Amino acid sequence: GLKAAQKTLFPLRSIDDVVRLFAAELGREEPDLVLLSLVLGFVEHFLAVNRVIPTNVPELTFQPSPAPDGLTYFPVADLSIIAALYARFTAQIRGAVDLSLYPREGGVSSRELVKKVSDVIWNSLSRSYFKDRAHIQSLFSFITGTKLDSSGVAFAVVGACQALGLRDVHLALSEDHAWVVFGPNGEQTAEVTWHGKGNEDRRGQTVNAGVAERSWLYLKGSYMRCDRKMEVAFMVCAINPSIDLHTDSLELLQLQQKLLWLLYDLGHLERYPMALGNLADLEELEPTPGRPDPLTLYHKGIASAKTYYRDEHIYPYMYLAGYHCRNRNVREALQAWADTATVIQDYNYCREDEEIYKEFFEVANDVIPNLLKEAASLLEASALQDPECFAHLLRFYDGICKWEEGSPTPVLHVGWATFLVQSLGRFEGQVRQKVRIVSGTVAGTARGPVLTFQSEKMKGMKELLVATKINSSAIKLQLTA
Numbered sequence: 001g002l003k004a005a006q007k008t009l010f011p012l013r014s015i016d017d018v019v020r021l022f023a024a025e026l027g028r029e030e031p032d033l034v035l036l037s038l039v040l041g042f043v044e045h046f047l048a049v050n051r052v053i054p055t056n057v058p059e060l061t062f063q064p065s066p067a068p069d070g071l072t073y074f075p076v077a078d079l080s081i082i083a084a085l086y087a088r089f090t091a092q093i094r095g096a097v098d099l100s101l102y103p104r105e106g107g108v109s110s111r112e113l114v115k116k117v118s119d120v121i122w123n124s125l126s127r128s129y130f131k132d133r134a135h136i137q138s139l140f141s142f143i144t145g146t147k148l149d150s151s152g153v154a155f156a157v158v159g160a161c162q163a164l165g166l167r168d169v170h171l172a173l174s175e176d177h178a179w180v181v182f183g184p185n186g187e188q189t190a191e192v193t194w195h196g197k198g199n200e201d202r203r204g205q206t207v208n209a210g211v212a213e214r215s216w217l218y219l220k221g222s223y224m225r226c227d228r229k230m231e232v233a234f235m236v237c238a239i240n241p242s243i244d245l246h247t248d249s250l251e252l253l254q255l256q257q258k259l260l261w262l263l264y265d266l267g268h269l270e271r272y273p274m275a276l277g278n279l280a281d282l283e284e285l286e287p288t289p290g291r292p293d294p295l296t297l298y299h300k301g302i303a304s305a306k307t308y309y310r311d312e313h314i315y316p317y318m319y320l321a322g323y324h325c326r327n328r329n330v331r332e333a334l335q336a337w338a339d340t341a342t343v344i345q346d347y348n349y350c351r352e353d354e355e356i357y358k359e360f361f362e363v364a365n366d367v368i369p370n371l372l373k374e375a376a377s378l379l380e381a382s383a384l385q386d387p388e389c390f391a392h393l394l395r396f397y398d399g400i401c402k403w404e405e406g407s408p409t410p411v412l413h414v415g416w417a418t419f420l421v422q423s424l425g426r427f428e429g430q431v432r433q434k435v436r437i438v439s440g441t442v443a444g445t446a447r448g449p450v451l452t453f454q455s456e457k458m459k460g461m462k463e464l465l466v467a468t469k470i471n472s473s474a475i476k477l478q479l480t481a
């Protein structure tokens with residue numbers, strides 16, 4: 001439950017008071033996921049969901065403070081409110097699960113116990129709500145309005161176990177899906193939520209099938225297996241500062257940024273590539289004096305993927321690519337998307353991989369065509385003059401092509417083809433000819449850009465791609481096969 005070491009830090013009257021609770025919690029042997037989720041969820045409710053300060057409520061108060069260009073009001077997180085909310089969740093969990101019926105084999109949770117905790121959270125939810133609704137991720141949401149998004153159900157099942165005393169049960173994460181790891185060596189896996197809009201009830205099953213299938217959703221096995229400190233990182237990354245689609249809460253942005261720096265300094269972001277990208281994103285908006293520059297952090301997110309996850313992740317390269325696209329750095333952006341397709345090349349496109357398909361489809365047929373049209377504008381009184389850009393674009397299509405190989409459903413269709421022709425066309429034949437497409441000559445070493453295609457489709461297209469006159473039909477037909 002809630003002990004004095006936690007309660008004496010209440011009331012949380014400012015942002016620094018929230019960072020203080022989190023600092024203290026990250027120093028305990030077992031940081032309380034429930035209390036930290038409800039707290040984040042309480043400040044988020046008043047800062048983004050419902051900003052209209054209440055009149056009927058007497059217990060609730062707000063804290064004035066000077067805003068940066070009058071006053072800014074903060075929801076005072078009274079111990080009273082939060083404790084009641086904490087007591088509600090524990091009682092609900094404890095009252096539903098009877099651990100005397102489950103035999104703990106020397107501090108080890110069994111599948112049958114895990115699936116029950118999973119069923120408890122699952123059956124507590126409302127029958128009809130929008131799944132992609134913002135701010136339904138925290139435990140505050142689960143208790144106060146009983147709504148949880150896909151990844152939020154997984155964290156609540158981990159939260160609920162820690163309440164029951166189950167320590168071996170941890171959050172498992174890919175780049176678009178969440179589940180649970182448990183057992184005597186943390187090698188047992190279990191599905192606790194749903195993925196996408198409309199699919200079978202995989203809940204309670206192993207993750208083994210998606211790993212062997214070579215789907216991006218299961219990251220060929222190199223996914224994150226969180227410890228308590230990483231589960232806190234997820235929860236912070238899950239703060240949503242959006243008030244609406246155009247405006248965001250400055251305090252929620254400042255909060256998340258302060259929290260990420262706390263987690264970072266303690267080394268808890270070393271095995272979390274996307275949190276580093278998020279930190280960089282926020283550092284570009286409001287930079288913190290005496291801290292690494294966004295690019296340094298973007299590159300730390302990639303470094304983490306390379307070291308701890310066999311370079312099998314897409315988004316650390318997407319985070320960098322977004323940064324360059326924001327600042328019209330065409331070669332640096334095209335380079336990062338080419339790097340992205342180099343990661344996806346060794347995967348196989350499955351039905352459930354629609355989130356990253358939509359991602360590659362937009363860059364190949366909306367974002368890249370928009371950067372090159374803007375580059376063509378500037379040309380009338382440089383990237384289109386750079387042969388290296390052309391190699392990056394070519395390397396990007398090589399990636400999608402290799403991805404399609406061995407996959408059940410097609411990736412490339414008639415819609416992709418026109419934007420390849422059009423994008424090739426933005427590069428002059430003199431520029432395109434400066435790129436040498438070489439298979440290789442001699443293997444290893446003995447004691448004008450060069451490019452090597454890893455896919456059949458692009459290898460067959462070699463001569464057409466470099467030709468002064470682009471044979472549209474031949475490139476369209478070859479890419480569509």
Ligand SMILES: *[C@@H](CC(=O)N1CC(S(=O)(=O)c2ccc(N3CC(CN4CCC([C@@](C#N)(c5cccc(F)c5)[C@H]5CCC[C@@H]5NC(=O)OC)CC4)C3)cc2)C1)CN(C)C
Pocket residue numbers: 137151173174175176177178234237238274275278315318319321322323325326327359362363367
């Ligand atoms: C030109 C273009 C430009 O700037 N654009 C287009 C590019 S892009 O390269 O197409 C591009 C860049 C960046 C992204 N981002 C998506 C975001 C990454 N993450 C993925 C995980 C996700 C989840 C969710 N939902 C999640 C779910 C399940 C399991 C998980 F592991 C994570 C969140 C759940 C709650 C927390 C978690 N977040 C998290 O782990 O870290 C934050 C969050 C989003 C990177 C996409 C595409 C950009 C510019 N001109 C127009 C000027």
